[PDB]
Amino acid sequence: VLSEGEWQLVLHVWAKVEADVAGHGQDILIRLFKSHPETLEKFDRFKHLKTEAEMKASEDLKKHGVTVLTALGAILKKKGHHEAELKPLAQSHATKHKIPIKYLEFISEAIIHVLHSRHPGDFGADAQGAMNKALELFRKDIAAKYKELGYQG
Numbered sequence: 001v002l003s004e005g006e007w008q009l010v011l012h013v014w015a016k017v018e019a020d021v022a023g024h025g026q027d028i029l030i031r032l033f034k035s036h037p038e039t040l041e042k043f044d045r046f047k048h049l050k051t052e053a054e055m056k057a058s059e060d061l062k063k064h065g066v067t068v069l070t071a072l073g074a075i076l077k078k079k080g081h082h083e084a085e086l087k088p089l090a091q092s093h094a095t096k097h098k099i100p101i102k103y104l105e106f107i108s109e110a111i112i113h114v115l116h117s118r119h120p121g122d123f124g125a126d127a128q129g130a131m132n133k134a135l136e137l138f139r140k141d142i143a144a145k146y147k148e149l150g151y152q153g
């Protein structure tokens with residue numbers, strides 16, 4: 001459960017993300033691809049991307065970073081009442097992308113790392129703890145929908 005004050009922490013850092021969604025999105029996906037290169041074979045769209053250099057210059061990668069952060073931001077802003085906003089995301093990742101839950105733990109770690117590098121004055125122990133809890137509720141809810149489809153992974 002996040003306390004209301006922990007949701008406020010999440011939302012306060014989020015507003016920082018929002019002032020530069022494309023830069024945050026690039027950092028996050030690159031971080032993910034560098035830390036868990038196997039996840040990159042799950043994105044059809046990025047098969048031409050090899051070097052870090054290539055990732056940084058990619059428009060496909062930047063535009064996707066925006067799409068990912070827009071969808072997640074809409075979910076975080078709901079403070080746990082996100083069934084509507086999460087359902088479409090869950091079902092597509094299950095059916096169309098076949099993304100194991102594990103991948104969701106990887107991109108969570110990436111987001112946490114990036115927030116910390118970028119907004120350290122805002123991203124202390126208290127904020128990291130609340131974000132961790134928000135992302136873990138997000139995964140748990142995703143895993144519930146996967147279940148309903150019979151989608152393992």
Ligand SMILES: [C-]#N
Pocket residue numbers: 068
């Ligand atoms: C889609 N990350």
